[PDB]
Design a protein around this ligand. Sequence first.
Ligand SMILES: Cc1noc(C)c1C[C@@H](C)C(=O)N(C)C
Ligand SMILES: [Zn+2]
Length: 140
Amino acid sequence: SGAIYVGNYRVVNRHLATHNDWANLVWEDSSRDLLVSSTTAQGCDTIARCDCQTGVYYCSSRRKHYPVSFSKPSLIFVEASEYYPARYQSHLMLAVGHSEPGDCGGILRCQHGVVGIVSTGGNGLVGFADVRDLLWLDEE
Ligand SMILES: Cc1noc(C)c1C[C@@H](C)C(=O)N(C)C
Ligand SMILES: [Zn+2]
């Protein structure tokens, strides 16, 4: 589990979005595994605006933050997980590391701020849903 809290937005994995998220929906994209809802209180996070390929991510199933190198966001085939069938996921970055289903929502961060959240795992990789192209998160 986990979210990004930027401005008056809450960014979550689409598959973990709550009824309250859907009732306060700003934007959602199944192909990216992302959903954004509106918040009453302002959040503590800053979104990275950059093309970094190194950062640190939180792994809940290890209680640890790991430094990783990761691929630029692309269209990637993802094998079946407990929460999605085998399918293409867009705007996905991969790194070598540990990820189980419950690790979804852990932040990946670089020197510029939050890059994305954990969205995929298995076979020794961790996949992250990018948010650095969602420039509208920084206003309004
Ligand atoms: C799909 C997809 N996933 O992440 C990105 C980025 C895209 C959309 C578009 C920018 C694209 O296809 N590129 C450059 C790979
Ligand atoms: Zn960066």
